[PDB]
Subunit: 205 residues, 4 copies
């Protein structure tokens, strides 16, 4: 599936209908994807992940910083599956940051050889970052490598790359929240939201 | 505040995008309000309730059976507020069924409501007749205040005009199930609010 | 041959209240945290699996014994629901409520797998009375889950099928267990102090 | 201040059969030592403690990978919950660092003038935290505090005590809640003690 499709003309929600941290009160335009909805969708994705990847040792690879919340929650749902089912599989974890592009941190990638590798991202936009990471990862001969991304953006700048698991397909809009940032701000927000002009100006680099 | 407005044209969500119990796989047509969204809205309502009612002992009345999930979750969010704040107020609970005065079944003596901040908690307001008549009874026990929280309010021409004090979601005139709301006692064991299909309608019919 | 639950010893000190988040209106009224809320959840998660193992073969009716059972009931059912939607296999579940020995329409029990959900078993006389009434409605099976079972000489020997914790002969409150209707609005199970005992005394 | 929840040397832990446990670790664990839910309850109180002390100014929360990731996520979730249900709050930014040399973080100048919260899974000798602190202090934070889920009672301690502590535990090797043995047991929600067969099976 393309995930939960959020239409171009999605109006989102009035902030007054939700609990919002006060320090971001004027910096947000609308709530775009409620935290709870992210959780419900992530619950189903964890089941899809275990269906496809639960046959062999999984290495879950978090793409920092944006990926950290989705990663923690996805893995928590996966762990819930594994302790309430008959069949389970070991899972190990690693974290990388990407800074053209080179991998920062992480274990020696020879640890990926022969494993079912799940790369976890916050968002796919152009897809160039994932294309680059995949090309690296495949050189270490994983048993399989799959990508799960909370968000996929509809954009004419797309190179054509599509991930294996998708939370939501969104319009070409700049979103923040749930660890997605604007100049490092708004990671401390449980909902995905759209940033206001006031907010854009306030936290401008 | 009419709460979160779900419009008449809202298509809801395809079932294959969520985790759905297999025994209801053919009996639902769409997810209408995802459980997580109910939780986010209920978190906000809990704050609203403490703002207005947190000044004096609250008696929270759960209207069984449909109200039980909203009740449990609303009170959980209120408790979270109360153990992470500087000022706090005791809350007691009671559970009632409803069917001259409206008949209140299974609760404490209504003298328990006297001088208290009474919060009546419902799953849904439709015609509003049930809440109007319950309020006429409860006022006679002289509460310090009485307010109603309802997860759902229907837009319907059959409404007698009653509006609750706290509302989660304002929805169309369609039959919804899940989050303890039932069709012939089924679908209470579903975490999302959903619209029932025509095939599910027949299977669980009288 | 069955789990006796998490056994809490007679000498269990519990936990300093200052280590946890506690509602301020109960700060002077509680002596110790006895069973942390989160531990109740962990045990309840396991109990849900045990329930589906024994009862998941046929339509389950969960019967909540009010008022004290309401929290355990809601949480236990939420864990059962999670089990039912994250697997290809599932079974319908209906719910009912009864308050108690006098009772306050149980045709919803006939031919089904009945799970009675209780907060605590002490003497056992209440459960023996409820069971004899429930069996008159000819259910397919009846089992009882109780969050707590108390070790007491006054026990008539009733043992529930599912037990969260086996506790000493101490009066506990919280997680919907009350003292004169107070302390239901508390997430942890706790022991009541001498101050609270007298403050909310009837 | 407090010493945290004190777990005694003779703490028996819990029978594994009382809890939900991943089957692939069924013979690799001896006991449940700290139930996941108890960690959450303690972490909820720690979040309130942190905000009381650090909530007056922009906080930079530093996660010490890999073991700190679960405690970090949950602590910050409870802090987020406070910030959206209170009248006033403060922004928080985050960074993740691995130690071997600080790897993968932002330039340390980003800490200058900020309230810095370092978040760790466990303090044993305390040498790591003394080292990390000495580095951070070169960049003049407004304040710097350490939160550790676990602090061991050990004569190997150099004497360093963190500002926020979840649990003070015996000198035993524990796993779970992102704490590992040769990278295993991070996918376990409880904190547990490893069995002899588990140590053998996952031996490096
Ligand atoms: N907060 C937000 N961030 C976005 C948005 N669209 C893209 N991005 C990304 C900006 N971004 C980063 O800030 C990377 C560093 P970190 O924040 O530590 O994960 C990478 C962008 O994600 C997509 C690229 O990987 P791609 O074009 O190669 O597919 C957006 O609508 N909101
Ligand atoms: N599942 C569903 N139930 C609905 C719906 N609209 C109304 N109702 C209610 C049906 N109903 C009951 O079944 C009562 C018993 P319980 O199920 O144990 O709470 C009461 C109706 O709620 C509105 C009335 O109180 P009111 O018209 O006086 O305002 C609906 O769209 N779905
Ligand atoms: N808060 C607490 N309540 C307790 C305690 N021991 C017993 N009890 C029970 C007191 N109680 C009630 O108040 C019933 C009404 P409700 O509060 O609305 O569910 C029933 C007692 O539970 C056991 C009996 O059913 P049993 O002796 O027949 O097995 C205790 O240590 N704390
Ligand atoms: N799983 C476990 N790990 C432990 C335990 N005691 C110490 N440790 C630590 C082992 N360890 C690591 O493996 C670092 C890498 P990572 O696992 O990715 O965070 C660091 C040790 O923590 C304390 C040191 O910082 P310190 O002596 O300087 O205070 C333990 O009882 N169980
Ligand atoms: Mg990213
Ligand atoms: Mg970014
Ligand atoms: Mg109702
Ligand atoms: Mg109904
Ligand atoms: Mg009882
Ligand atoms: Mg009682
Ligand atoms: Mg560490
Ligand atoms: Mg380690």
């Amino acid at each position: 599936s393309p995930g939960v499709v959020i239409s171009d003309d999605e109006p989102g929600y009035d902030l007054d209908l939700f609990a919002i941290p006060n320090h971001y009160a004027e910096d947000l335009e609308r709530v775009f994807i409620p935290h709870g909805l992210i959780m419900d969708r992530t619950e189903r994705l964890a089941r899809d992940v275990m269906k496809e990847m639960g046959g062999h040792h999984i290495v879950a690879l978090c793409v920092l910083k944006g990926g950290y919340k989705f990663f923690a929650d996805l893995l928590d749902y996966i762990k819930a599956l594994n302790r309430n089912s008959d069949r389970s599989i070991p899972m190990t974890v690693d974290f990388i940051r990407l800074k053209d592009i080179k991998v920062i941190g992480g274990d020696d990638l020879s640890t990926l050889t022969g494993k079912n590798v799940l790369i976890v991202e916050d968002i796919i936009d152009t897809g160039k970052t994932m294309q680059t990471l995949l090309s690296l990862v495949r050189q270490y001969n994983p048993k399989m490598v799959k990508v799960a991304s909370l968000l996929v953006k509809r954009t004419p700048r797309s190179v054509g790359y599509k991930p294996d698991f998708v939370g939501f397909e969104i319009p070409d809009k700049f979103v923040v929240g749930y660890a997605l940032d604007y100049n490092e701000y708004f990671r401390d927000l449980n909902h995905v939201a759209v940033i206001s002009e006031t907010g854009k100006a306030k936290y401008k680099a």
